[PDB]
């Protein structure tokens, strides 16, 4: 069994959506090692939610995915962090190294949102997953700006 594992050799919306989500959760696991304890726990919960979404999509809707409580949790974080981000007109991506990782994760989340949207159009399954991914890209953007602001504010203290 060891030599085989799991093998995927076809291109269809379900396979593409799950692969992008697998890419998204792998990059989040990489990025969670550059943030503080609070953001690390948040990112791990997001990884668990992505597994539920993959379980729903990989099961073609037979297996239950995320719940509406998870979407509310993402929305509360977005609302909480939007107050802190005094709106910046434009910021170059990658203000800090940690912010750059989150921007990469946001782009993969946006692509995953597009792929899952294709699945929803084709099969009618995955409305909650699409909503979660839209909120996730917005939240990832907000976290990068917050990291830049907090790191910049400590830079103003050392001078």
């Amino acid at each position: 069994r060891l030599f085989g594992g799991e093998e995927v050799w076809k291109d269809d919306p379900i396979i593409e959506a799950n692969g992008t989500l697998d890419e998204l959760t792998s990059f989040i696991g990489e990025a969670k090692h550059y943030v503080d304890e609070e953001m690390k726990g948040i990112l791990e919960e997001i990884q668990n939610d992505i597994y539920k979404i993959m379980g729903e999509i990989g099961s073609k809707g037979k297996i239950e995915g995320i719940s509406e409580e998870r979407i509310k949790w993402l929305a509360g974080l977005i609302e909480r962090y939007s107050e802190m981000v005094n709106k910046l007109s434009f910021v170059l991506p990658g203000g800090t190294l940690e912010s750059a990782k989150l921007d990469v994760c946001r782009t993969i989340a946006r692509r995953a949102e597009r792929k899952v949207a294709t699945v929803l159009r084709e099969f009618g399954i995955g409305t909650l997953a699409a909503i979660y991914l839209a909120l996730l890209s917005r939240l990832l953007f907000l976290l990068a700006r917050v990291i830049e602001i907090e790191k910049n504010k400590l830079k103003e203290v050392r001078s």
Binding site: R1, F3, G4, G5, E7, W9, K10
Partner: protein, 301 residues
Amino acid sequence: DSPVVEVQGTIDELNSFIGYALVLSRWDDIRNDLFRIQNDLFVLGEDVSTGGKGRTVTMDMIIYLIKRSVEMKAEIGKIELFVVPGGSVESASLHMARAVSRRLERRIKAASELTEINANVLLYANMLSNILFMHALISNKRKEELDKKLLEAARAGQDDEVAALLAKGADVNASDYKGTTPLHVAAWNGHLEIVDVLLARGADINASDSYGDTPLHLAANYGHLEIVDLLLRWGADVNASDSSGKTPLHLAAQDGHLEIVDVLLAHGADVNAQDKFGKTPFDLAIDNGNEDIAEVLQKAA
């Protein structure tokens, strides 16, 4: 469901060919591989039929086909391209099993365009075509293994090795590059015991080497009378011509063998046959100083 049926009929067909080359190949490791392939052709068919519901072609199945395909490419060494099929029966059956296996790929490549087929089906199909090819190559390397020992054992007078070799399928008519066959070597050296066991297995009693010599030539040339009789009793050509044109009577007349000249003349040797030098058996007897042979040829008219 039309395309999946033709694959089943070709998978089933290949299994008949695989089972045939199995019962032919006299080596244990080849038959072990072939039997696993046969039991895997069931799973491979069950994979295409159920579309993935029942048994499925696993990667460990494909991996085992490569493990053996690497182990065999080591014993083979350099694999010459543009090689003609049908080397030996055990090998030739494997060549035909390969050609059917490659047809199953063509049947699979068609059906996959009409029904989702797990990729491992064509992967195992492609690996089966490869590993069958190594089976045929090894079969011929070992057929040339025994045949190079039969020519060796026939030279060294290995009455017991020639027995084990011919019992294990060493081609009795195995021709060297010189054209020398084990029957040639046995008459040359003079091991009468091997000459019979070779002719019993179906030795070519009048094989020609590069020189054009027949076993009867060598038997008459080197004074082994006992072999001259049994060769002629088996229908050896008593007036065969080599490149020089000399017959067994010429060679027996040159080297001073009266009792062999007497036997070769009895089965119909030609006193009047001439080599490319115009010299008759009556000449070559006079040329070499052998007199008692010339009068037997002189009074033969």
